[PDB]
Amino acid sequence: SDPLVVAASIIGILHLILWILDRLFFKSIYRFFEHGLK
Amino acid sequence: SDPLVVAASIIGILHLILWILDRLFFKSIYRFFEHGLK
Amino acid sequence: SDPLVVAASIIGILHLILWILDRLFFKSIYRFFEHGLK
Amino acid sequence: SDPLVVAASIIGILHLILWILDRLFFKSIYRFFEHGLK
Numbered sequence: 001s002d003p004l005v006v007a008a009s010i011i012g013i014l015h016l017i018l019w020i021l022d023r024l025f026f027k028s029i030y031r032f033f034e035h036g037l038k
Numbered sequence: 039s040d041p042l043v044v045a046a047s048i049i050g051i052l053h054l055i056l057w058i059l060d061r062l063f064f065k066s067i068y069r070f071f072e073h074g075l076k
Numbered sequence: 077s078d079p080l081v082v083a084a085s086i087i088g089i090l091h092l093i094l095w096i097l098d099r100l101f102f103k104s105i106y107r108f109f110e111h112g113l114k
Numbered sequence: 115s116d117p118l119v120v121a122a123s124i125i126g127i128l129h130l131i132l133w134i135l136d137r138l139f140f141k142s143i144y145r146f147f148e149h150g151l152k
């Protein structure tokens with residue numbers, strides 16, 4: 001038992017899925033250029 | 039049951055909350071432009 | 077008997093080799109500047 | 115001694131000091147601009 005490990009293995013899966021979820025890499029770069037300037 | 043795991047699960051909670059902390063900087067691109075140039 | 081940890085230590089080895097692998101490939105900025113301003 | 119965890123907690127300590135250490139390298143942005151140009 002001791003779910004402490006269970007939460008540990010899941011915390012690792014989270015950061016992983018999250019990393020990719022953030023690096024998804026989207027197209028359309030002009031949009032970002034417009035967000036910075038006008 | 040030893041603390042070794044306690045520090046492990048916590049080390050994950052940190053790296054995670056941290057990375058997300060840097061991602062909340064979404065947008066705000068003009069600041070990066072003025073930072074590079076003069 | 078308790079592979080839960082085995083999968084945990086491996087989940088970290090992945091996220092790790094990943095972040096690094098992504099840091100070895102991220103140059104090519106002129107291609108983004110063009111594909112964007114079009 | 116079930117070192118499996120020892121390697122796990124250490125694998126996390128690395129990924130952490132790494133992400134940060136990498137965040138202390140990117141100092142100015144004019145370097146990325148000169149990289150793309152040409």
Ligand SMILES: C[C@@H](N)[C@]12C[C@H]3C[C@H](C[C@H](C3)C1)C2
Nearest residue numbers: 019020021023024094097098
């Ligand atoms: C998460 C991201 N850095 C990626 C995901 C896939 C694996 C690696 C190369 C490419 C495709 C990008 C790393």
Ligand SMILES: C[C@@H](N)[C@]12C[C@H]3C[C@H](C[C@H](C3)C1)C2
Nearest residue numbers: 018021022057058059061062
């Ligand atoms: C960590 C960050 N990229 C976000 C934050 C919020 C949760 C996840 C999707 C989206 C919104 C982006 C992850």
Ligand SMILES: C[C@@H](N)[C@]12C[C@H]3C[C@H](C[C@H](C3)C1)C2
Nearest residue numbers: 095096099100132135136139
């Ligand atoms: C993973 C990457 N950012 C590196 C890897 C090595 C350690 C840090 C400096 C340099 C060499 C680049 C971070």
Ligand SMILES: C[C@@H](N)[C@]12C[C@H]3C[C@H](C[C@H](C3)C1)C2
Nearest residue numbers: 056057059060133134137138
């Ligand atoms: C490494 C990065 N997450 C930061 C950079 C600055 C120092 C620390 C807190 C905050 C601002 C985030 C660490």
